Amino acid sequence: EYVKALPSQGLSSSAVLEKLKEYSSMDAFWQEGRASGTVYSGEEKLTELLVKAYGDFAWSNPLHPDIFPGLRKIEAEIVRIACSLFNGGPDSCGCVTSGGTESILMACKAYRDLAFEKGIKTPEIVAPQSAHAAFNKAASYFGMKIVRVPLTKMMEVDVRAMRRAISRNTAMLVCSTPQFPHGVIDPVPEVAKLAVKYKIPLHVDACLGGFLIVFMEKAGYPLEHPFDFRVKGVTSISADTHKYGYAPKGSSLVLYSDKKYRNYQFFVDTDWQGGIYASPTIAGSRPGGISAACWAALMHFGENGYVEATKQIIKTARFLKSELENIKGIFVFGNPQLSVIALGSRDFDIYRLSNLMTAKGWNLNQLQFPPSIHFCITLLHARKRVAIQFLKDIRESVTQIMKNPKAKTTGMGAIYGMAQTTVDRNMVAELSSVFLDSLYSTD
Amino acid sequence: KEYVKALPSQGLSSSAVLEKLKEYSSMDAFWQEGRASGTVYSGEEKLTELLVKAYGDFAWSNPLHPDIFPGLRKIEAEIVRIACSLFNGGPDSCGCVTSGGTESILMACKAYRDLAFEKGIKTPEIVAPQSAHAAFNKAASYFGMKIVRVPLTKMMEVDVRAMRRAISRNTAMLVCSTPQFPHGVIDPVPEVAKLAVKYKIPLHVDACLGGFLIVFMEKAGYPLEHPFDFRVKGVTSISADTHKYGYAPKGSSLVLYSDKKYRNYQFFVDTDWQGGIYASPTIAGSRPGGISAACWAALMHFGENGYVEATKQIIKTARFLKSELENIKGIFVFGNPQLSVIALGSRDFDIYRLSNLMTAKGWNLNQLQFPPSIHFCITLLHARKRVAIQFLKDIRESVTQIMKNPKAKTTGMGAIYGMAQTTVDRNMVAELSSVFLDSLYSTD
Numbered sequence: 082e083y084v085k086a087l088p089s090q091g092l093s094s095s096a097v098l099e100k101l102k103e104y105s106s107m108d109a110f111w112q113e114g115r116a117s118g119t120v121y122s123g124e125e126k127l128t129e130l131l132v133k134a135y136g137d138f139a140w141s142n143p144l145h146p147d148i149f150p151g152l153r154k155i156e157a158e159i160v161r162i163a164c165s166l167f168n169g170g171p172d173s174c175g176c177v178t179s180g181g182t183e184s185i186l187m188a189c190k191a192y193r194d195l196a197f198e199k200g201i202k203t204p205e206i207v208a209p210q211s212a213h214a215a216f217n218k219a220a221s222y223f224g225m226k227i228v229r230v231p232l233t234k235m236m237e238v239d240v241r242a243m244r245r246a247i248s249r250n251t252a253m254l255v256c257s258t259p260q261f262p263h264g265v266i267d268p269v270p271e272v273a274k275l276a277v278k279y280k281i282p283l284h285v286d287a288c289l290g291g292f293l294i295v296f297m298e299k300a301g302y303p304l305e306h307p308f309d310f311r312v313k314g315v316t317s318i319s320a321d322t323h324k325y326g327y328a329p330k331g332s333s334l335v336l337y338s339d340k341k342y343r344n345y346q347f348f349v350d351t352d353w354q355g356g357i358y359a360s361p362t363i364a365g366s367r368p369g370g371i372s373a374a375c376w377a378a379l380m381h382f383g384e385n386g387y388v389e390a391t392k393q394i395i396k397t398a399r400f401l402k403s404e405l406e407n408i409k410g411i412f413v414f415g416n417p418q419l420s421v422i423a424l425g426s427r428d429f430d431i432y433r434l435s436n437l438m439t440a441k442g443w444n445l446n447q448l449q450f451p452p453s454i455h456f457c458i459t460l461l462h463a464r465k466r467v468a469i470q471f472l473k474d475i476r477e478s479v480t481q482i483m484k485n486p487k488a489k490t491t492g493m494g495a496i497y498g499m500a501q502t503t504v505d506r507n508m509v510a511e512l513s514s515v516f517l518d519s520l521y522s523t524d
Numbered sequence: 525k526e527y528v529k530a531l532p533s534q535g536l537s538s539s540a541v542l543e544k545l546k547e548y549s550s551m552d553a554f555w556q557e558g559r560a561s562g563t564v565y566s567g568e569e570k571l572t573e574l575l576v577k578a579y580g581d582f583a584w585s586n587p588l589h590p591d592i593f594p595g596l597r598k599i600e601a602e603i604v605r606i607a608c609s610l611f612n613g614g615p616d617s618c619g620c621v622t623s624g625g626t627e628s629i630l631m632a633c634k635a636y637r638d639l640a641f642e643k644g645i646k647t648p649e650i651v652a653p654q655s656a657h658a659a660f661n662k663a664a665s666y667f668g669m670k671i672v673r674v675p676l677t678k679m680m681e682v683d684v685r686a687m688r689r690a691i692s693r694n695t696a697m698l699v700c701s702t703p704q705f706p707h708g709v710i711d712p713v714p715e716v717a718k719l720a721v722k723y724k725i726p727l728h729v730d731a732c733l734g735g736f737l738i739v740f741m742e743k744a745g746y747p748l749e750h751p752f753d754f755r756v757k758g759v760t761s762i763s764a765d766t767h768k769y770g771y772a773p774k775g776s777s778l779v780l781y782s783d784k785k786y787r788n789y790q791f792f793v794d795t796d797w798q799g800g801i802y803a804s805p806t807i808a809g810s811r812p813g814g815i816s817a818a819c820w821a822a823l824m825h826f827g828e829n830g831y832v833e834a835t836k837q838i839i840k841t842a843r844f845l846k847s848e849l850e851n852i853k854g855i856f857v858f859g860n861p862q863l864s865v866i867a868l869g870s871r872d873f874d875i876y877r878l879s880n881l882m883t884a885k886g887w888n889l890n891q892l893q894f895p896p897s898i899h900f901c902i903t904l905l906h907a908r909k910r911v912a913i914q915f916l917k918d919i920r921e922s923v924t925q926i927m928k929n930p931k932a933k934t935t936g937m938g939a940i941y942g943m944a945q946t947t948v949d950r951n952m953v954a955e956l957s958s959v960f961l962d963s964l965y966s967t968d
């Protein structure tokens with residue numbers, strides 16, 4: 082069953098593609114629209130365009146701008162288009178990255194280097210509890226301390242608690258538009274007031290929300306507060322084109338209010354024997370085809386395509402939100418204004434609902450601290466009209482659970498519940514490593 | 525043409541988008557003719573069509589979700605196992621698929637730093653040859669490690685006596701390259717591994733460049749004098765680029781370990797995240813699954829026979845050029861390159877005048893430094909396009925022209941690379957590099 086060595090004799094192109102169809106046939110699940118997030122559009126004609134766009138630039142590598150000046154122009158444009166969407170102005174700038182993690186790591190690294198220059202020995206990240214796991218990856222990789230501040234009952238960062246966490250060591254403040262767990266937008270203007278007063282950079286994580294939030298007003302769903310470069314104090318924004326931009330996986334952006342901030346993310350080796358070496362991001366060689374396909378997605382959708390995609394997603398999310406808020410036995414966490422809806426229960430163990438949804442063919446995210454489950458609506462969910470079945474299955478599952486509310490939680494839901502209660506955090510860390518080792522298994 | 529600075533009011537059709545992209549692709553250099561050193565390793569039409577179809581079949585697959593994409597998870601487990609076997613790893617060996625050589629190097633450095641922290645070392649050190657990739661400096665800077673760059677011998681190989689003297693209670697890892705990029709010289713892996721074993725320090729072998737050539741050298745009829753892989757006791761990790769001599773798409777590489785105990789330190793785990801228990805093996809979260817599918821397609825399509833044949837063709841081209849370049853008065857070759865890279869110097873004139881004349885003749889050679897040098901890296905493209913003859917004619921012509929006035933002033937870009945080495949203030953060179961990086965994002 083497993084290929085464990087290079088074949089003695091190479092397979093023909095047709096034989097290779099025949100074998101790959103057997104692998105791709107096991108990766109079909111998402112097509113019915115039963116997976117939370119994961120695939121943002123997945124539309125046939127869009128995929129054909131993005132694959133052709135990638136193919137046209139397959140061998141292009143932005144490590145060589147002299148060999149590929151066309152790709153260099155494509156990337157400069159993706160960044161400028163994004164700065165304009167976030168109302169940056171002429172001083173704003175940015176970089177194309179491989180994903181939201183890289184966009185976050187680059188900002189954290191820039192802010193650490195700026196803090197070092199100021200005499201801070203151990204720079205600190207002050208972020209809400211809800212901030213992406215990538216902020217912990219940044220702390221661990223870059224040797225920064227991470228302070229995670231508690232949330233309000235509405236799943237927003239408690240701004241009084243954030244103010245109390247700021248110190249002489251604080252290198253950056255964080256907030257999310259929205260945070261992934263509950264799909265709640267953090268109070269950007271209130272956090273930016275702290276950023277301005279204490280003269281600390283502020284990173285806005287719009288990896289998830291980016292290509293929705295920017296089109297909210299034009300779609301007829303304006304947000305109550307500003308969230309972008311128009312907010313004084315916001316120094317950087319991360320936004321995922323691979324999400325609501327409908328671009329291929331492997332594409333994201335890190336945007337800065339000024340070049341002075343971006344300079345600290347750059348890597349330079351002036352003395353290398355292999356020549357003067359300069360790189361703007363983590364990678365050296367990069368897949369230029371991915372940037373070409375990202376540019377193709379932006380150009381193909383345009384302002385009208387994105388406003389329309391946003392209208393469709395928001396109509397679906399608001400419909401589900403109002404319906405999920407009228408089901409006895411469950412409640413929705415905070416006030417989600419975007420594509421993500423998180424659920425809880427004070428009457429039963431919520432993981433019993435995700436257990437029943439799994440049995441009905443759905444893949445919902447199992448959250449923790451507090452026990453919760455979520456579903457993230459994409460353009461695929463809007464197109465396939467999955468909301469009706471999602472609602473019927475939730476209602477059925479909740480009805481079944483409400484017959485025996487004190488009954489034992491079984492399967493995977495029991496594991497996620499136990500993992501939160503476990504006093505030894507090292508056992509959970511050990512089982513995560515075992516899970517990661519299992520992914521590379523050829524046994 | 526002019527710059528797109530904002531999202532169009534109305535989205536362009538698929539055909540309009542592709543028409544516009546052809547204008548961007550048409551402005552890219554004549555790499556197809558084989559005049560660019562390294563950069564593109566095959567670029568063959570029918571191979572590209574297969575890899576694009578392989579990518580397309582897995583376009584939306586994301587290895588962050590192995591439960592949604594178990595087929596891609598199988599593909600990646602296999603790429604790693606195939607590579608471990610090529611480096612003679614055995615059942616205990618393991619690895620990860622990465623986005624490139626830089627990531628493969630950063631992951632090993634990060635694993636070795638975390639292992640050193642666990643042992644009480646506060647500021648872990650990297651002990652590497654002067655020739656080691658720039659990515660080792662990126663690792664030092666990112667991860668808060670000290671980098672000790674050890675000098676080379678006259679043959680451009682690590683000075684093993686200097687490396688023994690550089691080792692300390694702080695040393696987290698030893699490094700050597702198979703081969704180093706500047707001169708294409710293979711470092712003495714068994715000699716460095718003797719230090720690794722004695723001092724109980726991990727050893728990383730950088731085979732990013734050489735990986736998919738070195739592994740096929742013996743079968744191609746060009747066996748190397750010494751072992752270089754997991755069969756060498758002390759070698760704990762190997763980085764190898766599939767996107768190079770594997771002919772896989774850009775965005776693919778490997779980091780391999782002799783034992784799972786080493787790989788565990790590269791992993792990232794967030795047990796307490798509100799968004800769920802989060803575990804990631806490499807730097808990225810979401811990853812382009814299509815790239816891994818196309819990498820698996822390249823490996824399967826070439827097989828041992830296609831790789832051994834590609835290696836035979838590259839080495840024949842490399843050895844022919846080496847012997848010819850060693851018989852030109854006015855130039856010399858650095859060390860004894862046994863692979864695809866040949867570096868040149870001159871004791872009679874400024875070498876950068878040769879790269880200036882080669883650029884005027886339509887060639888793109890790498891301009892090295894410390895010492896002043898230039899190089900050309902042979903790919904399957906150079907062997908298929910059969911540019912060896914023209915490369916040799918152009919080198920001979922250029923050297924003849926330069927030898928008429930050996931003390932004459934170096935102009936253009938060659939003068940800049942020469943001055944950059946002599947400049948006492950290294951901060952000015954660092955400032956101009958930032959200015960160069962800012963220029964890449966220009967829409968003016």
Ligand SMILES: C[C@@H]1CN(c2nnc(Cc3ccccc3)c3ccc(Cl)cc23)CCN1c1ccc(C#N)cn1
Nearest residue numbers: 144145146147355356357358359944952953956957960
């Ligand atoms: C313009 C030169 C060049 N430069 C660059 N640095 N790295 C790479 C990436 C790379 C390096 C080596 C081998 C392979 C890839 C480049 C790639 C392409 C290119 Cl056109 C440039 C690059 C950095 C800025 N720069 C200089 C020049 C002089 C001074 C001074 N005094 C400072 N900087």
Ligand SMILES: C[C@@H]1CN(c2nnc(Cc3ccccc3)c3ccc(Cl)cc23)CCN1c1ccc(C#N)cn1
Nearest residue numbers: 496500509512513516588589590591799800801802803
């Ligand atoms: C299997 C679970 C979960 N797990 C995983 N960790 N991260 C991601 C990446 C990710 C996380 C959250 C949101 C999006 C992506 C996963 C992705 C998919 C999947 Cl099937 C698993 C993942 C690994 C560890 N693990 C557990 C479980 C229980 C205990 C104990 N007691 C310890 N570990």
